[PDB]
Structure formats: C-alpha cells, structure tokens
C-alpha cells in the first residue's frame, strides 16, 4: 500500500531535492571557474541525492553494501537526468541551476565539455519531442538509481519492479491505446542508453580535469570520483 503506484509517485514527488541555488561568477567564465561552478554544484547535488535516495520506500531497508554501490554507479547519470528535466522547455540551453543557465556555445571555454553539452542537449530535445511528463521523469530517475551497477537483491528487484509498475501506471493515466502506451514506454527507456552514454563521457572528462589539475574537487564528489 505504501508502494501502490499512486502512493509511490506521491512519495517520489515529495522526495524531490530542493533547487540548489548557485549563481554565475561576476567575471566571464574561464575553463577553471566554469569547472569550479559545475563541480561545486555537483557536490551540493550529491549531498541532496543521498537524502533523496533515502526517501525512496525500501531503499534504507537494502543492504548497506547495495545502497553504496547503487549510488556510486548511478550518480552522474541521475545528475544528468535532473539537468535534462530542468532544461526540457529551454532549447539551446542547460539549466544547471535557476541562476546558473549556460548557452551551448559557452562550453567552448572548457576543453572537451562541448561534445558532452551537445549529447545532453540532443538527448533533452528527444525528451521534449516526446513531451516527458514530470511524473514520468520521477519514476525514470528512480529507475536509473535502482537498475544501476541475498534478501537485499530480492528487496532491490521488488523495489525496481514497483517503480516500473508506477511508470506504467503514469503512462496509463494518459488514456492512449495499449499499443501506444507500450511504444511510449519503449521510447522513454531507450533514451536512457543515451543518458548513460553521456554520463560515461562526463565521468571520463571529470577524471581528466582532476588529474590535469584544471580544478580541485572536494568532499563527496572527490570520494565518489576516487572510488570510480
């Protein structure tokens, strides 16, 4: 009952992290200060991601080992899924935060990032084309966490099954034909390969920026990144 589709969607809705309010530097963006802004933001969002995950019914009931490895495995992709949702109604732009809004061309100042921006924007545009709904977004983001990477594996599979059931239920609220609900479901899930692809490139790029000492990273971002 705590996991009926409607109750689960409502819990995910209430579980949403708050808007991480960060601003642009007064100065124009350099390679260093853009990366500092983006990594500072990501670390702050990493703090809130853990709190968000703890509010998904049954997540804290999972083995501590599973809770760690799932968050370790999915965090970049979840971060990117959040970014695309925030940016869905704003073509050509990436709404990293409400006061941190970057145009596509501004990625030119950081080496290698522009290609990733294009992946993010291109994937966001497909989600806009499909008219991704907020409640579809909530289920999908939770599915990224839970499908990433004894009694805990059963609890995990069951918890993943419930969020999937919730997405099917949200889609069924539209009242389109059973054919079209299936097509919509496939279209949404197939886009996650592109988000995953973007997250792997983003991880690689961030690792390179850290080793080359373009930016220092701290706290939770550093730890997640040292872990791989």
């Amino acid at each position: 009952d705590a996991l009926s589709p409607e109750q689960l969607v409502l819990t995910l809705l209430e579980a949403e992290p708050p808007h991480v309010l960060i601003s642009r530097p007064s100065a124009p963006f350099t390679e260093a200060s853009m990366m500092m802004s983006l990594t500072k933001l990501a670390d702050k969002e990493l703090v809130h991601m853990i709190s968000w995950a703890k509010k998904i019914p049954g997540f804290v009931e999972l083995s501590l080992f599973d809770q760690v490895r799932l968050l370790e495995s999915c965090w970049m992709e979840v971060l990117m899924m959040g970014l695309m949702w925030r940016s869905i109604d704003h073509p050509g732009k990436l709404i990293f935060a409400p006061d941190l809004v970057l145009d596509r061309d501004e990625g030119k100042c950081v080496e290698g990032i522009l290609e990733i921006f294009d992946m993010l924007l291109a994937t966001t545009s497909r989600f806009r084309e499909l008219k991704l709904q907020h409640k579809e977004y909530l289920c999908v983001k939770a599915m990224i966490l839970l499908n990433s990477s004894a009694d805990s594996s059963r609890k995990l599979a069951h918890l993943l099954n419930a969020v999937t059931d919730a997405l099917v239920w949200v889609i069924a609220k539209s009242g389109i034909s059973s054919q079209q609900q299936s097509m919509r479901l496939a279209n949404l899930l197939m886009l996650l390969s592109h988000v995953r692809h973007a997250s792997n490139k983003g991880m690689e790029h961030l690792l390179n920026m850290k080793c080359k000492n373009v930016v220092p990273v701290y706290d939770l971002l550093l730890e997640m990144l040292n872990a791989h």
């Binding site: 703090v47 853990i50 709190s51 703890k54 501590l64 809770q67 760690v68 968050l71 370790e72 706290d219 939770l220 730890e223 997640m224 872990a227």
Partner: peptide, 12 residues
Amino acid sequence: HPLLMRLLHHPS
C-alpha cells in the same frame, strides 16, 4: 566510502 556512509547513516 566514509562520507557516503556518513550521509547514508546521518540525517541532515
């Protein structure tokens, strides 16, 4: 994973 384990066990 010290910070991740803290934030998984400590509420804030």
